[PDB]
Amino acid sequence: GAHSHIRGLGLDDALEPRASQGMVGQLAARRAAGVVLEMIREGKIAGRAVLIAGQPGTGKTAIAMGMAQALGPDTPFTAIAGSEIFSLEMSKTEALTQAFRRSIGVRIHTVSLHEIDVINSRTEIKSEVREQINAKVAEWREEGKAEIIPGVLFIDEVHMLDIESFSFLNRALESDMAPVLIMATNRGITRIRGTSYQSPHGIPIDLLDRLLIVSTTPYSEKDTKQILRIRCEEEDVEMSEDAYTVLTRIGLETSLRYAIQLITAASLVCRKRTEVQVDDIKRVYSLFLDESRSTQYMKEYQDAFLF
Amino acid sequence: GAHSHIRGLGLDDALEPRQSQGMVGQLAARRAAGVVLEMIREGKIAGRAVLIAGQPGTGKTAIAMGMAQALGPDTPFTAIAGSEIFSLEMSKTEALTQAFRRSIGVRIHTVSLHEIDVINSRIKSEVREQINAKVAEWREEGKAEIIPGVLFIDEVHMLDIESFSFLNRALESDMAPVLIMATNRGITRIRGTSYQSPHGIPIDLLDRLLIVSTTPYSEKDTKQILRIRCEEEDVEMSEDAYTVLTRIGLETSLRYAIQLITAASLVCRKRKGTEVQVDDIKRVYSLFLDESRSTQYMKEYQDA
Amino acid sequence: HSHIRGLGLDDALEPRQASQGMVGQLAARRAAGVVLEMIREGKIAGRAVLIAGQPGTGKTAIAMGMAQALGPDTPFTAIAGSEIFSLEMSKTEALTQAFRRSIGVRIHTVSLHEIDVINEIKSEVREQINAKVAEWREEGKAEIIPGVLFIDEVHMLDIESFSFLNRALESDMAPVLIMATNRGITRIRGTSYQSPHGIPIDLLDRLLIVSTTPYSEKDTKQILRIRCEEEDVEMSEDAYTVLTRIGLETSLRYAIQLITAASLVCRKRKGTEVQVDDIKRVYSLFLDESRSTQYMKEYQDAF
Amino acid sequence: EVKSTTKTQRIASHSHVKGLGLDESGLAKQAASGLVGQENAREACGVIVELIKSKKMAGRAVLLAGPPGTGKTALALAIAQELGSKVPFCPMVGSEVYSTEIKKTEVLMENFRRAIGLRIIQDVTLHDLDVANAREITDKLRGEINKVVNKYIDQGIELVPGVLFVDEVHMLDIECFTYLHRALESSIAPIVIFASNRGNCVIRGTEDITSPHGIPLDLLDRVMIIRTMLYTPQEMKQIIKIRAQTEGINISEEALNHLGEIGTKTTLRYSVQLLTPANLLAKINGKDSIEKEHVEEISELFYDAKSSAKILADQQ
Amino acid sequence: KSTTKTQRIASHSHVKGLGLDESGLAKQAASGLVGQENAREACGVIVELIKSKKMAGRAVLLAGPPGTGKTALALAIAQELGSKVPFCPMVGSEVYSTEIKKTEVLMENFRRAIGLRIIQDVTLHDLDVANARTEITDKLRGEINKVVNKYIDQGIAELVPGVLFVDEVHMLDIECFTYLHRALESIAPIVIFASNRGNCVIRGDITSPHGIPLDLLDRVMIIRTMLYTPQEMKQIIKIRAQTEGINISEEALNHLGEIGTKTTLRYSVQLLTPANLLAKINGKDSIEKEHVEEISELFYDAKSSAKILADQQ
Amino acid sequence: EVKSTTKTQRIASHSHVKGLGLDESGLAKQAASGLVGQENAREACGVIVELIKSKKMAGRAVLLAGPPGTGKTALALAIAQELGSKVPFCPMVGSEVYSTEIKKTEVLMENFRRAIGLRIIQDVTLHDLDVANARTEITDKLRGEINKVVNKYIDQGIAELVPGVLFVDEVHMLDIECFTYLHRALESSIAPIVIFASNRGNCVIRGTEDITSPHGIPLDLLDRVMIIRTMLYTPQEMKQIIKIRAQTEGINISEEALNHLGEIGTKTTLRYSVQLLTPANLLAKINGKDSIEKEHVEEISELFYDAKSSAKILADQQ
Ligand SMILES: Nc1ncnc2c1ncn2[C@@H]1O[C@H](COP(=O)(O)OP(=O)(O)OP(=O)(O)O)C[C@H]1O
Ligand SMILES: Nc1ncnc2c1ncn2[C@@H]1O[C@H](COP(=O)(O)OP(=O)(O)O)[C@@H](O)[C@H]1O
Ligand SMILES: Nc1ncnc2c1ncn2[C@@H]1O[C@H](COP(=O)(O)OP(=O)(O)O)C[C@H]1O
Ligand SMILES: Nc1ncnc2c1ncn2[C@@H]1O[C@H](COP(=O)(O)OP(=O)(O)O)C[C@H]1O
Ligand SMILES: Nc1ncnc2c1ncn2[C@@H]1O[C@H](COP(=O)(O)OP(=O)(O)O)C[C@H]1O
Ligand SMILES: Nc1ncnc2c1ncn2[C@@H]1O[C@H](COP(=O)(O)OP(=O)(O)O)C[C@H]1O
Numbered sequence A: 001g002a003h004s005h006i007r008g009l010g011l012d013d014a015l016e017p018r019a020s021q022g023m024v025g026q027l028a029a030r031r032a033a034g035v036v037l038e039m040i041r042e043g044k045i046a047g048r049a050v051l052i053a054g055q056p057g058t059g060k061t062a063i064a065m066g067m068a069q070a071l072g073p074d075t076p077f078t079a080i081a082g083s084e085i086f087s088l089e090m091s092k093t094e095a096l097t098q099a100f101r102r103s104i105g106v107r108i109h110t111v112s113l114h115e116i117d118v119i120n121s122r123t124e125i126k127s128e129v130r131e132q133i134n135a136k137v138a139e140w141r142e143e144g145k146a147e148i149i150p151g152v153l154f155i156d157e158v159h160m161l162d163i164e165s166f167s168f169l170n171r172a173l174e175s176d177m178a179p180v181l182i183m184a185t186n187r188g189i190t191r192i193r194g195t196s197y198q199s200p201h202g203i204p205i206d207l208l209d210r211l212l213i214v215s216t217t218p219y220s221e222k223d224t225k226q227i228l229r230i231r232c233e234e235e236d237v238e239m240s241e242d243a244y245t246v247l248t249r250i251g252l253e254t255s256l257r258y259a260i261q262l263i264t265a266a267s268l269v270c271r272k273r274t275e276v277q278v279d280d281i282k283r284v285y286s287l288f289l290d291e292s293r294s295t296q297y298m299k300e301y302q303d304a305f306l307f
Numbered sequence B: 001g002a003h004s005h006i007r008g009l010g011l012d013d014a015l016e017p018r019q020s021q022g023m024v025g026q027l028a029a030r031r032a033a034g035v036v037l038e039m040i041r042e043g044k045i046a047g048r049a050v051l052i053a054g055q056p057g058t059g060k061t062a063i064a065m066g067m068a069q070a071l072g073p074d075t076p077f078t079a080i081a082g083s084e085i086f087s088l089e090m091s092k093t094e095a096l097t098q099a100f101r102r103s104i105g106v107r108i109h110t111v112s113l114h115e116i117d118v119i120n121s122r123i124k125s126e127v128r129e130q131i132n133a134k135v136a137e138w139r140e141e142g143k144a145e146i147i148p149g150v151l152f153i154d155e156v157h158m159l160d161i162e163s164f165s166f167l168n169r170a171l172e173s174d175m176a177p178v179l180i181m182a183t184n185r186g187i188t189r190i191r192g193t194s195y196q197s198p199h200g201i202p203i204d205l206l207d208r209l210l211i212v213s214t215t216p217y218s219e220k221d222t223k224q225i226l227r228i229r230c231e232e233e234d235v236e237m238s239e240d241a242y243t244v245l246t247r248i249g250l251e252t253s254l255r256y257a258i259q260l261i262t263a264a265s266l267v268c269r270k271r272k273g274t275e276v277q278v279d280d281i282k283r284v285y286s287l288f289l290d291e292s293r294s295t296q297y298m299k300e301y302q303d304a
Numbered sequence C: 001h002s003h004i005r006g007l008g009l010d011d012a013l014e015p016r017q018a019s020q021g022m023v024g025q026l027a028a029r030r031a032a033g034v035v036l037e038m039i040r041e042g043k044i045a046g047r048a049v050l051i052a053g054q055p056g057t058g059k060t061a062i063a064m065g066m067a068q069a070l071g072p073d074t075p076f077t078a079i080a081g082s083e084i085f086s087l088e089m090s091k092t093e094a095l096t097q098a099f100r101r102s103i104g105v106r107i108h109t110v111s112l113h114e115i116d117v118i119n120e121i122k123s124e125v126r127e128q129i130n131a132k133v134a135e136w137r138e139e140g141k142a143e144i145i146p147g148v149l150f151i152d153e154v155h156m157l158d159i160e161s162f163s164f165l166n167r168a169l170e171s172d173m174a175p176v177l178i179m180a181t182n183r184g185i186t187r188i189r190g191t192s193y194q195s196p197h198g199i200p201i202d203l204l205d206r207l208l209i210v211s212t213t214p215y216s217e218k219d220t221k222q223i224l225r226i227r228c229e230e231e232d233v234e235m236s237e238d239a240y241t242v243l244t245r246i247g248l249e250t251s252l253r254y255a256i257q258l259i260t261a262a263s264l265v266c267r268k269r270k271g272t273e274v275q276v277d278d279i280k281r282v283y284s285l286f287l288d289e290s291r292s293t294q295y296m297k298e299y300q301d302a303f
Numbered sequence D: 001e002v003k004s005t006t007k008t009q010r011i012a013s014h015s016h017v018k019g020l021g022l023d024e025s026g027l028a029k030q031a032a033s034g035l036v037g038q039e040n041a042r043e044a045c046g047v048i049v050e051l052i053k054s055k056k057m058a059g060r061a062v063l064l065a066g067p068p069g070t071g072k073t074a075l076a077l078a079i080a081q082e083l084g085s086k087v088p089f090c091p092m093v094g095s096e097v098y099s100t101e102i103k104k105t106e107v108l109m110e111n112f113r114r115a116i117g118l119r120i121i122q123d124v125t126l127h128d129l130d131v132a133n134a135r136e137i138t139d140k141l142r143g144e145i146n147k148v149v150n151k152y153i154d155q156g157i158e159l160v161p162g163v164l165f166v167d168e169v170h171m172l173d174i175e176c177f178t179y180l181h182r183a184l185e186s187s188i189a190p191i192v193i194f195a196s197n198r199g200n201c202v203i204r205g206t207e208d209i210t211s212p213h214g215i216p217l218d219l220l221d222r223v224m225i226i227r228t229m230l231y232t233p234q235e236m237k238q239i240i241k242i243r244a245q246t247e248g249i250n251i252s253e254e255a256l257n258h259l260g261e262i263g264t265k266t267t268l269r270y271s272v273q274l275l276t277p278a279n280l281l282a283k284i285n286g287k288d289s290i291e292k293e294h295v296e297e298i299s300e301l302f303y304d305a306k307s308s309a310k311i312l313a314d315q316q
Numbered sequence E: 001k002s003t004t005k006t007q008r009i010a011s012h013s014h015v016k017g018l019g020l021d022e023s024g025l026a027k028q029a030a031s032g033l034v035g036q037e038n039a040r041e042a043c044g045v046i047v048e049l050i051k052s053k054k055m056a057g058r059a060v061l062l063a064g065p066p067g068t069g070k071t072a073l074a075l076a077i078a079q080e081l082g083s084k085v086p087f088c089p090m091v092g093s094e095v096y097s098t099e100i101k102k103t104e105v106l107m108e109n110f111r112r113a114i115g116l117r118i119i120q121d122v123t124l125h126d127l128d129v130a131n132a133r134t135e136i137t138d139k140l141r142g143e144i145n146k147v148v149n150k151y152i153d154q155g156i157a158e159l160v161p162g163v164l165f166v167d168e169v170h171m172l173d174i175e176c177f178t179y180l181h182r183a184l185e186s187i188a189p190i191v192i193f194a195s196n197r198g199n200c201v202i203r204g205d206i207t208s209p210h211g212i213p214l215d216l217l218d219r220v221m222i223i224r225t226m227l228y229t230p231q232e233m234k235q236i237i238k239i240r241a242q243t244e245g246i247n248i249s250e251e252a253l254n255h256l257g258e259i260g261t262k263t264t265l266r267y268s269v270q271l272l273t274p275a276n277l278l279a280k281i282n283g284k285d286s287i288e289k290e291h292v293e294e295i296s297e298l299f300y301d302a303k304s305s306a307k308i309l310a311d312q313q
Numbered sequence F: 001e002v003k004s005t006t007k008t009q010r011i012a013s014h015s016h017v018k019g020l021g022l023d024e025s026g027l028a029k030q031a032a033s034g035l036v037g038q039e040n041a042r043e044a045c046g047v048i049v050e051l052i053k054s055k056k057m058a059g060r061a062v063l064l065a066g067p068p069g070t071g072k073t074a075l076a077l078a079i080a081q082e083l084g085s086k087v088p089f090c091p092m093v094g095s096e097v098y099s100t101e102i103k104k105t106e107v108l109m110e111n112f113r114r115a116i117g118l119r120i121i122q123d124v125t126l127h128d129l130d131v132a133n134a135r136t137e138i139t140d141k142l143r144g145e146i147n148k149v150v151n152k153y154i155d156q157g158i159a160e161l162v163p164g165v166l167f168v169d170e171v172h173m174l175d176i177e178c179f180t181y182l183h184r185a186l187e188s189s190i191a192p193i194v195i196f197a198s199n200r201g202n203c204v205i206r207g208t209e210d211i212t213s214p215h216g217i218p219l220d221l222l223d224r225v226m227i228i229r230t231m232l233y234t235p236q237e238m239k240q241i242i243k244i245r246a247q248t249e250g251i252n253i254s255e256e257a258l259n260h261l262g263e264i265g266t267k268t269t270l271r272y273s274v275q276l277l278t279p280a281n282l283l284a285k286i287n288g289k290d291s292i293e294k295e296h297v298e299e300i301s302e303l304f305y306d307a308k309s310s311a312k313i314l315a316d317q318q
């Protein structure tokens, strides 16, 4: 796993972020997420939704994973990408229905609405089965046999979604059984897919006006160093103290995502002859590019093509 | 009715405009409309069509109304906008089909072809097939007579080529209504095409049109139109206010000046006033906006 | 055509300027000859042909000669890129039909398409004939000779169309592919991406491109002569010069159109041969595309 | 005794709106019936409620044109509250018609049914009966209710057409507008108010064709336009104070003044939306009301759309 | 029953043929036609070509300004071709229908352009409708063809393929040109296209002359039409008035002819009927200079009417 | 009892590619295992081949970014060879998924099946077993039976499932829907290694129309992608590749003609140069020569053309 270290948000009793629960830095976004958790607990989350604005690799997925963990240890979490709704074997809304149903859990021991639906379908998924389970769970909830635990639906790259998909989200959040919708994006003012209109995050204004927007800023040299040290532990990789300094500087230069991609690779270069050194970090840097170098060389080739 | 005051074109047998029958001003278009009326009555209108080119609210809808009214009584009429044919419930052709079947009447009162279709609908294609062959059956006996009227298609620039091709086909019928079209746009591209053309109508159709042009009304011409509509709305107004409202009609819109009459009587009424005064007007103008002031206020916000 | 019976090449692969009907276009004919030997020796596997040049440089003519220099029984199908866009036919169905038309079976030679016609065509009929043709080839009763498939205006062909040709050339019974275009760097139809000759880059990498040079006075003269010697229309030497002059100011295709029209004015004037008078009058009567657009631009610009 | 389908969430932020708040002459008081300032728009909304009642709104529609957060939704709810209490109100957004699951005709029809009701006193709507007699709402399921409703009317066992608020009007395609125009022509139909924040806009379902607020001129001609204006920090502070009273949230004038000056830099919606998380952060901090530093914290913890769009763009 | 669309051929009633002498030279005024000599002479060559069976695969394009007899010439080609030849005048845009498909729109106009001599002069379409009258199908077409074919094999009837005139050709799409390509490649009629435009994008970025693709234009012969002299304008208007039965003065003819050169020949001719009715209301027999001047002021040409709106904006 | 349905006309120009040409320490030799030059990419490919063996490629794919004729499909074949003998390699193009007759879901599935195999001893792919049962078509129900049979052999302990390499070229030609299918099937344990190739920089993702991303890959998948760079060859490396290319073809050529064919590659592309070795050899067979001299090489370069040059010739004329 990649978020294997995350066990919550690591905030104290006053929701103040204490490095804790597998979290490193990102204090402003953690306390903000903590406020969302209290707004959920009271019951003021209804009508509203959450959005994590920030650059790629700034902890957006980790914070929502922490948000689900802090809510409960037996609570559903469904991480999906904007592009995942555009599938050959499925519909845009069929992927979104499955994403919502995966997030709503049933206590009897816990089981999501999707597992209950997938079981009865296999005995894609006939719509008649879904309308039945909905009425069935409603009676079970009424009598007191089953308890509904609304989970967390994390949708990253939310700028890929269209007006038809945002319409679905508005209809699904209208349910009482509805989970907490934590969206995320790397985009500013872009056009809303399916329309000729430009908007912040590529989200329509009718949904923006109900959003709890949080911001994630890139990590410092000290923050980046601990994330890579926590990854080395999770990947059982031994590295020299000055290799961390070179890897983090590369992690600041390019990305943390790429720095983590280098951890796995740089250790097998060390396994070719004890502890990963600066030259193993430097060798694997020339061996594997970062997207910013990959596009630069292609631009340099296409520039000389005009000469 | 928005045109309730119209009873005809207000023309003498010498086809000169009285400057009558509900009409005021627009001397040019009123005379040309009478000439067009003569062609229909003389049966020299087949293959041909009419097009009233003019700025919004300069007579076009009323001139076509007055044309249908002067052609005698019980003459069928249908006033549809170009955008009306684009429906979620209907099809582009089916919407125009119903507009054509509405402007064609049958006399024993005069029952339009669309009314007959209404009896056998919740209109299905199988329904029209039975009725059409039954009308020619009533034509052999001579019991019934086909009296087609006027189909006024305003905002014609909205019509695409699939619908313009349908018009050609629909106008080819022996029993066909007189097609009167209206637009405010000059050289525009034909919807569905890459090519430009005057009024957004295909080149082939313009070579059949009896194009008439409506010019803007002067202060004296606007004051009589506003007087007629005031009298039509049972709204007694001060002559000081008739001036202010006509000034708003010239500076803004006639469609807007008429829009303020209805609301001005209520402002006057609520303050237990006798007749509508200038301060009822100044207020209703400050309360309700006109598209020009409405858009400029939005343009002034976006820049900030 | 009706004059192109082959390339007109010697044992050492060298054109003669006037042999087997072919006139001029030496380098391109010799380039075309090298392809013939690659088809012959069996080294045309996973490769295709393209002929690039201005309209009327004998691209279609060289394609006609290649099949004729392959045998007098070898099938030939010359489709245009603008002909796959049909109302009564799918873009891939028109290409399947053109492919099968290019693949002949021996008894007498009969195309795989002519076998479908006797029996658009259903995908059920296709599996039937293919299963029967698989039996005759194994037994020895019939001989499947893969012919020549010429595709002019190939810049018209879309992304799916080119993706079809890839699966169709993956066959062992597949015919040879020869394409033609007068366009340089053009966009690949069905995409925003541009490429040389409007062809996907992965197919261009497989093409054996041949360039055609425009004909000179003497080169154009023999081409017109041969066609006049074909159309049963006799004309003066003074008229031949006038017709080449026109055919070089306009195009070769337009010059050939004036042969049929000038021969008519001649007979109606009670003449033996077609003089200059019958050519210049027939030049003013019927215009070329280049002259036609010039007057319309003059009128539509002011109107 | 039946159920209510009413969208609670959509009208939760407007609970303080009890009507228009206009005196006998027709003029607006600064603060009355839950509404603060917005005098000219409230006064113009008065004439509309008069026009509906005097039966002079035939084929006519309304448009509220102003910047986002300037009480467009509040005034349309005020018109419903002015005609009488329990008079149906339907708050929809233009983008709601674009669903893969349900057809464009089915979305709109439901809203019109939600906007027309009947007093049997049983204060209920046409759509409330639809779900009750389906406990799928089809062409056949609807018609069965229409005949049942007609039977109660004929004898005397009362139809009340309400208000259908269509926000983000420019989002609608030309075909959606025709559906509205034909429906607005009927006598038993409800007054349709539209809301925009744009000028000359390209009508959806077309290309090239631009029109005021992206509304076809066929419809736009039979439309009464009311302008709504940006609130001052002072007008805003009065709204943020009223909302806190309605939610039972205690707050200091110092925090309120800062919350009001945020409304200037953001929207009236954004500031009021901070009233709840700040009240919750005070709960954690063991304080009764919201201090000036609680508002300043929730302003640092949470962002508006434009601010977060700027951060991402400036970082890149 | 003759199902010919009467209205489409109402402005060309006077056209009896090309009016060329035994050799092939145009007279100033012959067979209803005035001026347009080079085009009329070039049409005669095509008349001899079809009769020589040398138009195999070849099509025609009459290109020039609107109202320069492009439709009139195409009608005369059918007139000259033989005794009552099936002339069908279609428009490129006619295929774009929501009701019926392009295929059936094209087939209908094609069947309208192929006749049959049995002396009974009836087209394939005037028999297609006779079979159905609910709608013309492909199996129904086979029924008429089975009848049509036996007549020749019994020697009773002879087939006559005619003229299919197509104006606004640039309006047809890529699929429509492929349909025509098969049709021309056959007892098929002569496809005569007419374009008032130059280099045009083929419907369905690929620009080409007259909107016709290069694959079809390789087998197309172009005959240019030209604008008329004010003396030719007076003649054509006088012919139309003589064919319509309306009296008009030469003083008014100069003005009505001048109006035509300024606008179009089609619009000036179409001004005769209103000018006639203006005079009838005044109890007159003929049309004077004032009657023309009034109608020309009352009515506008689409070119100058859209100019007023642009002037006002 | 077995028959493979591999498209050899796709791996034709890679007959000399035995492996990567690396040593024990993981460094590339100047010339080894059929590959010349491209040392940094070859050293990187080895690190990938080593990671697939350690099983530390979970949810990871590879991207080769470089100009045409830089050995992208060559290195991908060498990856499959260096994985082991008879390891399944399936090369495809982004265009291939587009067809009006065959649905894109089936095209992607066909190539996915060719990229996974079994080891009993007769090495064959899962697509070979799909067509064998069809004496007609391949449906989902047909695959359902074949998979149950294929798993039963592993459930008993007869044949090990050996997945290999799935090489995808012109990745910018794939659409947003195609990318989801790849990413969802990439997560699978028994799935092959997906190798992408790009001669483009920042590109508009197909289906988005407006959205741009590096190499036309939606960022969700590019985060899981390992990038390796391919560079243009030095004229020394150029002659070296063409030399082995002539030897494997069995074509004899002078070192002087090799110098002219080598300099043409630098001017155009390496792919174009190797594609001149067959028309030149057959030309010499007509003249009467058992080797290729500069004469034939200069002639074929003047008679036959590359995309870039011929397109420029038409541009001059028009
Ligand atoms: N000459 C007139 N005499 C009497 N009433 C008139 C005259 N001209 C306009 N009106 C009245 O003023 C109103 C304005 O509508 P009208 O002129 O008919 O619209 P239009 O010019 O056809 O274009 P739009 O419908 O507004 O888009 C309605 C009409 O009855
Ligand atoms: N004039 C006002 N008086 C009282 N509350 C107001 C006023 N204007 C707006 N509000 C309240 O402010 C919030 C945002 O306003 P809203 O009506 O939704 O604006 P809009 O429709 O223009 O976006 C709502 O809670 C609304 O009730
Ligand atoms: N503040 C933090 N504390 C603890 N671990 C952290 C961390 N920020 C990152 N990480 C770890 O590195 C991983 C980087 O991926 P990701 O965070 O999901 O990027 P994105 O913005 O797209 O959502 C995830 C997380 O486990
Ligand atoms: N080398 C030659 N020898 C003899 N006749 C020749 C000729 N090259 C051309 N022609 C004749 O002129 C015409 C030219 O067109 P075409 O051959 O079809 O090719 P393209 O696509 O470039 O237009 C047709 C052909 O009969
Ligand atoms: N040379 C001539 N002699 C006699 N009458 C003539 C004539 N040229 C035209 N006409 C007549 O004028 C009318 C308009 O010409 P039209 O055929 O429609 O031209 P276009 O296709 O470009 O639109 C109708 C025609 O019969
Ligand atoms: N380093 C090397 N050593 C030996 N031969 C090499 C080689 N690099 C390439 N080649 C050979 O050149 C030929 C064309 O190269 P290709 O792989 O298809 O181009 P692309 O980068 O786009 O994928 C075939 C290939 O085996």
Ligand SMILES: [Mg+2]
Residues within 6 Å of the ligand: C055, C056, E218
């Ligand atoms: Mg050509």
